[PDB]
Write a protein that holds these residues in place. Structure first.
Motif, short mmCIF file in Angstrom:
data_model
loop_
_atom_site.label_atom_id
_atom_site.label_comp_id
_atom_site.label_asym_id
_atom_site.label_seq_id
_atom_site.Cartn_x
_atom_site.Cartn_y
_atom_site.Cartn_z
N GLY A 138 1.00 -1.45 0.09
CA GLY A 138 0.10 0.21 -0.04
C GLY A 138 0.37 1.21 0.15
O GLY A 138 0.45 2.17 -0.33
N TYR A 139 2.28 1.14 0.87
CA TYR A 139 2.16 2.46 1.02
C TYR A 139 3.51 2.55 -0.67
O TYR A 139 2.90 3.91 -0.70
CB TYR A 139 3.77 2.19 2.01
CG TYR A 139 5.09 2.64 2.47
CD1 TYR A 139 6.11 3.87 1.04
CD2 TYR A 139 4.46 3.78 3.39
CE1 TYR A 139 7.09 5.20 2.32
CE2 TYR A 139 5.18 4.89 3.88
CZ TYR A 139 6.58 5.58 3.40
OH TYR A 139 6.97 6.64 3.45
N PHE A 163 -0.45 5.99 -7.95
CA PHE A 163 -2.38 6.42 -8.62
C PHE A 163 -1.89 8.19 -8.25
O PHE A 163 -3.43 8.51 -8.73
CB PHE A 163 -3.22 5.84 -7.16
CG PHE A 163 -4.06 4.53 -7.77
CD1 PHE A 163 -4.18 4.29 -9.29
CD2 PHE A 163 -3.79 3.46 -7.16
CE1 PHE A 163 -4.53 3.06 -9.58
CE2 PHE A 163 -3.21 2.26 -7.48
CZ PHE A 163 -4.00 2.26 -9.29
N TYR A 164 -1.86 8.79 -6.62
CA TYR A 164 -1.82 10.50 -6.49
C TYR A 164 -0.76 10.78 -7.56
O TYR A 164 -1.29 11.83 -8.04
CB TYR A 164 -1.17 10.55 -5.44
CG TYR A 164 -0.70 11.38 -4.56
CD1 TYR A 164 -1.27 12.26 -4.30
CD2 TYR A 164 0.50 12.23 -4.90
CE1 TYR A 164 -0.93 13.51 -4.67
CE2 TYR A 164 1.12 13.22 -4.63
CZ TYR A 164 0.15 14.26 -4.63
OH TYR A 164 0.81 15.66 -3.81
N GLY A 197 -5.62 9.17 -4.58
CA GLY A 197 -4.90 7.95 -4.88
C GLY A 197 -4.94 7.69 -3.53
O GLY A 197 -4.82 6.09 -3.84
N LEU A 198 -5.38 8.35 -2.51
CA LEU A 198 -5.62 6.83 -1.04
C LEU A 198 -7.09 5.95 -1.56
O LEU A 198 -6.87 4.32 -0.86
CB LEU A 198 -5.91 7.61 0.36
CG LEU A 198 -5.83 6.98 1.04
CD1 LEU A 198 -4.77 5.84 0.95
CD2 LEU A 198 -5.67 8.24 2.64
N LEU A 199 -7.76 6.14 -2.12
CA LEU A 199 -8.78 6.15 -2.25
C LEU A 199 -8.40 4.54 -3.15
O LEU A 199 -8.88 3.58 -3.10
CB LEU A 199 -10.11 6.59 -2.22
CG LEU A 199 -11.33 5.42 -2.52
CD1 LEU A 199 -12.02 4.59 -1.15
CD2 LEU A 199 -12.90 6.27 -2.68
N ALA A 200 -8.20 5.17 -4.41
CA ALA A 200 -7.86 4.23 -5.60
C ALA A 200 -6.51 3.26 -5.16
O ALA A 200 -7.02 1.71 -5.55
CB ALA A 200 -6.93 4.69 -6.56
N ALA A 253 -0.06 8.69 2.47
CA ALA A 253 -0.30 9.53 2.06
C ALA A 253 -0.03 10.84 3.37
O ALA A 253 -0.21 12.18 2.89
CB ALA A 253 -1.87 9.30 2.70
N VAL A 254 -0.03 10.38 5.03
CA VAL A 254 0.02 11.43 6.23
C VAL A 254 1.69 11.96 5.58
O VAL A 254 2.39 13.35 5.44
CB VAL A 254 0.05 10.82 7.21
CG1 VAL A 254 0.94 11.97 8.11
CG2 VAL A 254 -1.14 10.44 7.06
#
Ligand code: CLA
Ligand code: CLA
Ligand code: CLA
Ligand code: CLA
Ligand code: CLA
Ligand code: CLA
Ligand code: CLA
Ligand code: CLA
Ligand SMILES: CCCCCCCCCCCCCCCC(=O)OC[C@H](COP(=O)(O)OC[C@@H](O)CO)OC(=O)CCCCCCCCCCCCCCC
Ligand SMILES: CC1=C(C/C=C(\C)CCC[C@H](C)CCC[C@H](C)CCCC(C)C)C(=O)c2ccccc2C1=O
Ligand code: SF4
Ligand code: SF4
Ligand code: SF4
Lengths: 160, 739, 130, 80, 61, 171, 41
Positions: F54-55, F61-62, F80-83, F161-162
């Motif tokens: 995931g990282y 995506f973002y 991007g996070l949702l994708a 994301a953070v």
């Protein structure tokens, strides 16, 4: 006349086509010099174009709305020189070819090595058979009558 | 009783001419089916199966080479004869920038005289795109009499090569030991052939081409130019143009080679008058090449205690990763003609492609850069020849593996170790091909679908996500800075394609910096992907030619066989020949894309006209940068747009190009009948046709059989290649001659 | 160097057996050779025989039989092919009765023999829904 | 596995048996021909369907016939 | 029928069905297909001879 | 010296002992990876794999999504996070169905010994056979592996994301 | 000149000669009487 067509001798678009072709050829002729071979060739082209158009006009040829000779091949003898006479000529020539081929196949088929005489033609026998094809319509309707033209049941058939 | 040749080995008789198939043990018995006829031509040059002796095969190959060289000499003699008699070469000499080269006139029959175009110079004929006029001008040929004499010499040479082939097959045929002197052969081909040919051509250039072309560029008409022999008998006609011949050969023998800088220059760039390479640079190049090749010819030990043994060199090149290394490679290349053919054909095709690139990149002939049809035709022809030769090299490598490969003689050497891990090679090449195709083509498709969806900022374009070929631009910068920094004795870059000024001859662009952007990135990666897939097919054919997990005894089936059967789920095309068939298809694809890229890029971003104030206007107008990034762009702005001249050629002097366009389409579509269908249907249809013939007593004694599976594939691929290449040929020629 | 002394002097190829010949079945061919002849593997490249007992493992019966057919060119005839299931379940395959299948041996019964030619086969329409 | 049938037109010329790559066919005693032998197919589980057997058959329309049927890792020639 | 006799092939699954061949030898043993017939036309496999039964050949007059 | 030899002294395997397959670097590097690191439960292996995946999955995506921004946008980061999270969900679905159709075991490294000792005269493929002795090769093991992959994927995507937001804001 | 004449009697040479002769008389008919769309009679 036939099919709404008109004779090419009275077709204005036919003469327009002739005039346009001649004008293009003359414009091409203008860019060369004196009696040089290019000018002679272009002049010969112009003369041949005029002769061809004149012959097509005086040929019982029917022209459509595009000024091009249309062929009347329904079978009428009036336009018989368009299809019927060439049809007879081709039928004669092609029957000649087929007859001489079949005669050669059947003649060398009764020799010791029939397959050898097919890649290496017996030119004497080939010439003998080929010049004998002028009677192919008569030879065909003298071998069909004797039953020598068609096989009956020695021909092979598949399983079903 | 010479130690190198055998005297009167074969009697000169016509008896075997009347016995077709005498060479083959199977075909000698005579034809029984029509398959014999096709087998006769398919085995004509397969000398390996005609004799069991390497000596006889070598002698046949030697005489066949002589026949081929005689054919080539006859072709060259015909070209020179056409230039002498049916050409406007004299008119083109006086006006190279306004007269189109024509060397073939067409007889006035069935209205075909329209093909005689207005090529200029009070001449009518077919425009010539082979660049012979520029080559003859570079040779210093200023009269058609010289062309006639060159044609006569070509005819004499062709007869001489025919006589040589007959002599060396029937009167004095060399022995196997003579053929296997690869050290002596390499020494001679490197020193004598290559080096002495370069030296002789440098001499001709210096004494004939340098003065005559300098006078031509100065404006002297060809009639008042002295005859070429007068430049040799009179040291004053050449010492006026190049005031260094007054010192004679003394500077050469006194090592004062700086005196010859008048005619042995190192300038780079192009001649501003003609747009071609400086002929002084060309003469200096050929001189240096001659010296280098003559030196290189003294390398291998032939008859004295001096030189190298190729066997000792190869056997010493082992390694931790490669086992026995190159041990046994000398025996492979001295006992197998197919291995030599593979290497030579692969490198020969690669050389042809390199030649094609360097041709347009640095135009070597006067007034050839501004003859766009000649440049396009030369590039496309040479790239096509290169691709075909590369596929042939792969084919003959596979043939060597099937036939001439000995497992015992190649224990743990390079060939053995390559076969031992063929899986790894083929799997990684498969992954690379998928990666490259996915990326290149899917970037193209992504651009197409983003444009179709109205999202212009999401493309892989210059005004969007940009993929700048930075590595190639770095190299371009390095070359344009080379004169004075890394090539300090150069006056100009090697080619203006890397950068520099726009070179125009008669308001027509000769060469110009070829900018590389995101459009060139995508097409270059397309080239890499297509080349990789072709390599994949050919290497899979070569490596899996002997055995596989499917067929562990594929070598026992030969190089050319259709299959092993419908079993194992189906074992079609497992041969190695069926891989040279698919590789031929993929080579066609790759070369077609390469020539399309060249044509569009040159027309859009190099070729064109230059205004008197220096404004550059191209043939198409720079549409390559923004419209070559989508498949719709290639379809519309290149294929549809530049096909206008081909489809509108009817009634003009280019109508033959439209006719050949249509006929090549017809042939390409005809190929698909053989490529898509199978033998059983055609055999069963021939069954009913034979029934009709038997009913009419006209069944041939030679039983008609449908073409074999392998021959069906060969016919299909040959027709496919002919149709596609002819369509591209007509399209390119009509487009580049019209504009 | 090698697991067993009777293995041919092969350097290993990435064309040998895979995970299938560890859980489904593997085939072993054994033979005795008078000379350490150099032969070509059905999978990869060249291997060297042992002047004595030779044992080779393959993933297919066809690979073992191709190797055996190659052995006949070395005047080697005593080669025998076995099938090994996931455990040591050895079954002699090729010289099934000790005589090669090309030579007639007593004690063999015809399998798959029809007492008629091809033309005597029943019509498919009469073989519907059985 | 594929199906292999032998027909009494067999002349016992052994060319089918010595062409089988997977040892499916064998020669067995017979009294219907001069050679006194007929081909048999006792190991059709190893039949791969390559049809080399009937490419070597000299009889008019074959004496060994291979009918492709259900597939198996042996019949598909899968080394994996 | 005997050696040198001309016969017509009655076997339907034959490349020489309805065709005429020359008998090479008729075996006198208890074989199933004793009649050996030689033909001028090779079949699809290249052979030009085959063994036929006594009821699969019909002598030509 | 020769740096390529038959793998484990077996010249008949479809494998080779090259300086890449059996090098000490390869050994250590593959033994420190979560899939082969010793002392890890299948849930821990799945969690680490999901975190890493995931990282690095939120990145493309973002950066290149349909809602990019040359500056920092909360909407782009959310997209991007949702994708990435939905892609992790798809991968977890694939893992779940693969484990459902592949294995029928709840405790491995024993059943093999039991059927090699106490006989396995049954329908096989569950008592006998059994490919692989790892704890990942069981119905329970693969289920926990998928659960860990899914949870770790969510956590790693959120963490990435953070980090992306912090880098774009404070740098 | 016994086997040379037999070589000239082969299928390719004979077909090439016959097709060359055929194309020749066709082309010459079309030269001497060009643009013949219908039967001359
Ligand atoms: C010259 C002898 C000859 C004769 C009498 C025939 C006669 C016939 N052929 Mg035929 N054929 C021939 C040669 C011949 N063929 C050859 C050489 C080929 C190979 C290309 C074919 C291929 C062929 C096909 C594929 C079909 C026929 C069909 C037919 C029948 C209808 C006519 C037709 O469609 O013409 C067909 C004619 C051609 C396709 C062109 C033939 C090519 C040339 C012109 C013939 C060869 C000339 C020969 C070299 C002359 C040498 C003789 C000399 C040495 C003395 C008819 C029984 C059709 C059929 O069964 O209908 C009942 C059919 O479907 N033929
Ligand atoms: C090998 C290459 C080659 C090629 C492709 C050609 C091709 C051609 N030549 Mg040619 N020629 C060649 C070599 C070649 N020639 C050589 C080496 C010579 C020197 C002897 C000539 C001397 C020559 C002359 C003198 C003429 C041609 C002509 C022609 C054209 C018509 C040919 C024709 O109808 O003959 C038909 C041939 C046969 C039917 C014989 C079978 C054609 C384009 C003619 C032309 O262009 O007319 C304007 C013409 O007049 N050629
Ligand atoms: C008139 C002169 C002459 C004569 C009588 C012979 C006679 C013979 N040669 Mg020979 N030969 C000659 C000249 C001659 N040769 C020349 C000049 C060369 C050098 C090229 C050779 C090279 C040569 C080789 C390498 C071999 C023969 C062989 C033979 C024997 C069989 C030939 C055969 O059946 O093929 C007849 C073939 C043809 C007529 C085809 C001609 C092919 C030409 C060159 C193609 C040109 C087409 C052109 C490129 C356009 C294509 C479109 C026979 C004794 C063979 C032999 O004895 O081995 C058994 C053999 O292997 N010859
Ligand atoms: C300096 C000496 C010399 C030269 C110039 C050549 C040149 C050539 N050799 Mg050659 N060769 C040599 C020494 C030489 N060889 C030696 C010592 C051996 C023994 C190992 C061989 C063995 C050999 C073989 C086996 C073959 C060649 C071939 C070739 C040709 C390659 C085709 C090519 O590039 O087209 C370039 C073509 C030209 C530039 C045309 C002009 C060339 C003419 C013919 C001069 C040839 C020089 C000749 C050796 C002089 C002998 C005359 C004779 C009276 C003694 C080329 C003509 C190949 C070939 O095509 O066969 C014919 C081929 O198969 N050679
Ligand atoms: C130096 C070049 C060279 C040489 C010496 C050879 C030599 C050989 N090749 Mg080879 N090959 C080459 C290049 C070469 N090839 C290239 C470039 C390719 C890639 C296409 C191949 C692909 C290839 C295959 C796939 C095979 C061979 C085979 C062979 C062997 C038999 C050839 C034969 O009998 O054909 C006799 C000649 C012909 C049958 C001519 C066929 C006519 C061609 C296909 C059409 C040409 C059309 C032409 C361009 C005109 C079209 C215009 C149109 C308008 C009419 C022989 C050793 C065969 C073999 O068994 O090797 C042992 C084989 O299977 N080669
Ligand atoms: C337009 C037609 C076409 C296409 C697309 C391909 C595509 C390909 N061929 Mg080829 N081929 C063709 C015609 C074509 N061929 C023809 C006519 C022949 C006859 C001679 C061959 C003969 C041939 C051989 C002999 C070989 C190939 C190989 C390959 C592959 C190279 C690897 C690659 O790029 O994969 C990547 C795939 C593509 C570039 C296709 C497009 C994929 C898009 C752009 C990206 C992904 C889209 C996405 C997944 C869609 C998902 C949504 C969907 C589920 C709805 C590739 C699949 C080689 C091979 O096996 O692969 C290594 C090989 O050896 N081909
Ligand atoms: C093989 C068929 C054939 C036939 C029947 C003819 C028939 C004829 N030709 Mg001829 N010709 C042919 C082939 C043929 N040609 C070929 C292949 C060429 C070379 C391209 C020529 C070149 C040729 C010339 C140059 C001349 C003829 C001329 C003639 C005519 C008088 C002789 C006559 C109608 C002459 C004529 O009538 O012109 C006035 C003439 O001068 N022909
Ligand atoms: C298969 C259909 C077909 C048909 C019916 C025709 C028919 C015709 N074409 Mg044509 N053509 C065709 C296909 C066809 N063509 C194709 C495929 C092409 C492309 C190559 C051409 C290209 C073509 C051109 C370029 C020309 C023609 C011309 C002609 C006409 C003159 C024929 C001629 O020379 O007669 C005279 C010759 C004969 C009658 C030969 C037989 C004579 C023998 C020796 C008689 C002996 C026995 C007594 C005629 C109407 C010409 C024309 O004037 O058009 C109007 C013309 O210039 N055609
Ligand atoms: C490029 C790598 C390279 O060529 O290094 C060269 C490397 C060194 O091999 P050797 O030292 O054994 O070669 C010595 C002699 O064989 C000279 O060829 O060759 C290989 O190991 C082949 C592996 C290719 C792996 C593809 C990646
Ligand atoms: C049509 C076809 C045949 C039948 C084709 C045959 C029998 C070829 C017939 C060729 C004739 C007899 C000679 C050639 C005639 C041409 C007019 C000459 C060529 C043209 C010149 C200009 C070169 C096959 O045998 C076949 C096999 C495998 C796959 C596909 C096919 C297939 O599609
Ligand atoms: S015929 Fe076509 S399909 Fe049937 S086996 Fe040979 S190749 Fe495979
Ligand atoms: S298919 Fe024909 S050849 Fe292959 S095994 Fe079965 S029978 Fe023997
Ligand atoms: S193939 Fe037909 S003939 Fe040859 S052996 Fe098997 S059965 Fe007897």
């Amino acid at each position: 006349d036939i099919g709404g067509l008109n004779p090419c001798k009275d077709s204005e678009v036919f003469q327009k086509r002739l005039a346009k072709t001649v004008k293009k050829l003359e414009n091409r002729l203008k860019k060369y010099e004196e009696g040089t071979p290019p000018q002679i060739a272009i002049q010969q082209q112009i003369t041949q174009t005029k002769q061809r158009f004149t012959r097509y006009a005086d040929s019982n040829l029917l022209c459509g709305n595009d000024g091009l000779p249309h062929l009347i091949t329904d079978g009428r003898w009036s336009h018989g020189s368009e299809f019927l006479l060439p049809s007879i000529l081709f039928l004669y020539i092609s029957g000649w070819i087929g007859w001489v081929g079949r005669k050669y196949i059947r003649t060398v088929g009764q020799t010791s090595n029939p397959t050898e005489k097919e890649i290496i033609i017996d030119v004497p026998l080939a010439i003998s058979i080929m010049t004998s094809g002028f009677l192919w319509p008569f030879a065909a309707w003298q071998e069909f009558l004797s039953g020598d033209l068609i096989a009956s049941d020695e021909t092979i058939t598949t399983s079903p | 009783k010479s130690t190198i040749v055998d005297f009167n080995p074969v009697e000169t008789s016509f008896e075997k001419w009347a016995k077709p198939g005498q060479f083959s043990r199977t075909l000698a018995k005579g034809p029984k089916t029509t398959t014999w006829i096709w087998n006769l031509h398919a085995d004509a040059h397969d000398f390996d199966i005609q004799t069991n002796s390497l000596q006889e095969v070598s002698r046949k190959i030697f005489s066949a080479h002589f026949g081929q060289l005689a054919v080539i000499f006859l072709w060259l003699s015909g070209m020179h004869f056409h230039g002498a008699y049916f050409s406007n070469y004299s008119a083109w000499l006086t006006n190279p920038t306004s007269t189109k080269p024509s060397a073939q006139i067409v007889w006035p029959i069935v209205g075909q005289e329209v093909l005689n175009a207005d090529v200029g110079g009070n001449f009518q004929g077919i425009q010539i795109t082979s660049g012979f006029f520029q080559l003859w001008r570079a040779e210093g040929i200023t009269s058609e009499v010289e062309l006639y004499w060159t044609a006569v010499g070509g005819l004499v040479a062709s007869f001489l090569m025919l006589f040589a082939g007959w002599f060396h097959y029937h009167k004095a045929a060399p022995k196997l030991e003579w053929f296997q002197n690869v050290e002596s052969m390499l020494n001679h081909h490197l020193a004598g052939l290559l080096g002495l040919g370069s030296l002789s051509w440098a001499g001709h250039q210096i004494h004939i081409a340098l003065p005559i072309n300098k006078l031509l560029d100065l404006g002297v008409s060809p009639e008042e130019i002295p005859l070429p022999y007068e430049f040799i008998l009179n040291r004053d006609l050449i010492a006026q143009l190049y005031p260094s011949f007054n010192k004679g050969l003394t500077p050469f023998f006194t090592l004062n080679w700086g005196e010859y800088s008048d005619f042995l220059t190192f300038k780079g760039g192009l001649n501003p008058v003609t747009g071609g390479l400086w002929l002084t640079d060309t003469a200096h190049h050929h001189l240096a090449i001659a010296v280098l090749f003559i030196v290189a010819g003294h390398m291998y030990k032939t008859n004295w205690f001096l030189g190298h043994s190729i066997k000792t060199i190869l056997e010493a090149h082992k390694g931790p990763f490669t086992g026995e290394g190159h041990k046994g490679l000398y025996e492979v290349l001295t006992t197998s003609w197919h291995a030599q053919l593979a290497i030579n054909l692969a490198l020969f095709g690669s050389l042809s492609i390199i030649v094609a690139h360097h041709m347009y990149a640095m135009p070597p002939y006067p007034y050839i850069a501004i003859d766009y049809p000649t440049q396009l035709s030369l590039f496309t022809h040479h790239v096509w020849i290169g691709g075909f030769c590369i596929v042939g090299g792969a084919a003959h490598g596979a043939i060597f593996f099937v036939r001439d490969y000995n497992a015992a003689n190649n224990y743990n050497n390079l060939i053995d170790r390559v076969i031992r891990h063929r899986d790894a090679i083929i799997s990684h090449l498969n992954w690379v091909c998928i990666f490259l195709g996915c990326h290149s083509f899917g970037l193209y498709v992504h651009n197409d679908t983003m444009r179709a969806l109205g999202r212009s900022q999401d493309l892989f374009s210059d005004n969007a996500i940009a993929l700048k070929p930075i590595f190639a631009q770095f190299i371009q910068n390095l070359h344009t800075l080379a004169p004075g920094s890394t090539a300090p004795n150069a006056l100009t870059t090697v080619s203006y394609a890397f950068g520099g000024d726009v070179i125009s001859v008669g308001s027509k662009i000769a060469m110009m910096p070829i900018s590389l952007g995101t459009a060139d990135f995508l097409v270059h990666h397309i080239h890499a992907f297509t080349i990789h897939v072709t390599v994949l097919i050919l290497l899979k054919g070569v490596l899996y030619s002997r055995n596989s997990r499917l067929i562990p005894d594929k070598a026992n089936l030969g190089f050319r066989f259709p299959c092993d059967g419908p079993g194992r789920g189906g074992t079609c095309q497992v041969s190695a020949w069926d891989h040279v068939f698919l590789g031929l298809f993929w080579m066609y694809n790759s070369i077609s894309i390469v020539i399309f890229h060249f044509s569009w890029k040159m027309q859009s971003d190099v070729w064109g006209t230059v205004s008197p104030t220096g404004a550059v206007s191209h043939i198409t107008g720079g549409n390559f940068a923004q419209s070559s990034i989508t498949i719709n762009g290639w379809l519309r702005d290149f294929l549809w747009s530049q096909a206008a001249q081909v489809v509108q050629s009817y009634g003009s002097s280019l109508s033959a190009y439209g006719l050949i366009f249509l006929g090549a389409h017809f042939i390409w579509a005809f190929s698909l009948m053989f490529l898509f269908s199978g033998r059983g249907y055609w055999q069963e249809l021939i069954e009913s046709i034979v029934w009709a013939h038997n009913k009419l007593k006209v069944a041939p004694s030679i039983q008609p059989r449908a073409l074999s599976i392998t021959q069906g594939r060969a016919v299909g691929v040959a027709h496919y290649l002919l149709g596609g290449i002819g369509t591209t040929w007509a399209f390119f020629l009509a487009r580049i001659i019209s504009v | 160097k090698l697991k067993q002394s009777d293995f041919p002097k092969f350097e290993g190829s990435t064309g040998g057996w895979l995970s299938a010949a560890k859980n489904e079945e593997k085939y072993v061919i054994i033979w005795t050779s008078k000379d350490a002849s150099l032969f070509e593997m059905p999978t990869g490249g060249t291997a060297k025989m042992n002047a004595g007992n030779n044992v080779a493992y393959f993933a297919r019966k066809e690979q073992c039989l191709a190797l055996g057919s190659q052995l006949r060119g070395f005047k080697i005839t005593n080669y025998k092919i076995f099938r090994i299931y996931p455990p040591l379940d050895i079954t002699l395959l090729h010289p099934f009765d000790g005589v090669f299948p090309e030579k007639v041996n007593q004690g063999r019964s015809p399998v798959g023999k029809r007492d008629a030619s091809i033309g005597g086969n029943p019509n498919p329409a009469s073989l519907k829904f059985q | 596995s594929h199906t292999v049938k032998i027909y009494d037109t067999c002349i016992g010329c052994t060319q089918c048996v010595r062409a089988c790559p997977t040892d499916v066919l064998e020669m067995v005693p017979w009294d219907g021909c001069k050679a006194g032998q007929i081909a048999s197919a006792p190991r059709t589980e190893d039949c791969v369907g390559c049809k080399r057997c009937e490419t070597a058959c000299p009889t008019d329309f074959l004496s060994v016939r291979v009918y492709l049927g259900g597939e198996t890792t042996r019949s598909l020639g899968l080394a994996y | 029928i005997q050696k040198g006799s001309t016969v017509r092939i009655l076997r339907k699954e034959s490349y020489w069905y309805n065709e005429s061949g020359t008998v090479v030898v008729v075996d006198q043993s208890k074989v199933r297909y004793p009649v050996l017939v030689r033909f001028t036309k090779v079949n699809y496999a290249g052979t030009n001879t085959n063994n036929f039964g006594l009821n699969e050949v019909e002598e030509v007059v | 010296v020769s740096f390529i030899k038959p793998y484990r002294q077996d010249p008949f395997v479809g494998h080779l002992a090259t300086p890449i397959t059996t090098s000490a670097f390869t050994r250590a590097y593959l033994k420190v990876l979560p899939a082969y690191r010793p002392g890890l439960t299948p849930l821990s292996r799945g969690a680490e794999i999901g975190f890493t995946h995931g990282y690095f999955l939120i990145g493309p995506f973002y950066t290149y999504g349909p809602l990019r921004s040359v500056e920092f946008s909360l909407t782009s980061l959310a997209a991007g996070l949702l994708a990435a999270i939905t892609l992790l969900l798809i991968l977890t679905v694939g893992l779940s169905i693969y484990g459902q159709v592949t294995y029928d075991v709840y405790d491995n490294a024993l059943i093999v010994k039991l059927v090699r000792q106490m006989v396995g005269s049954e329908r096989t493929q569950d008592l006998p056979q059994i490919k692989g002795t790892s704890e990942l090769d069981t119905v329970l093991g693969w289920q926990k592996f998928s659960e860990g992959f899914f949870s770790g994927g969510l956590i790693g995507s959120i963490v990435a994301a953070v980090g992306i937001a912090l880098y774009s804001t404070y740098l | 000149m016994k086997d040379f004449l037999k070589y000239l009697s082969t299928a390719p040479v004979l077909l090439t000669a016959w097709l060359t002769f055929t194309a020749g008389f066709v082309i010459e008919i079309n030269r001497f009487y060009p643009d013949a769309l219908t039967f001359p009679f």
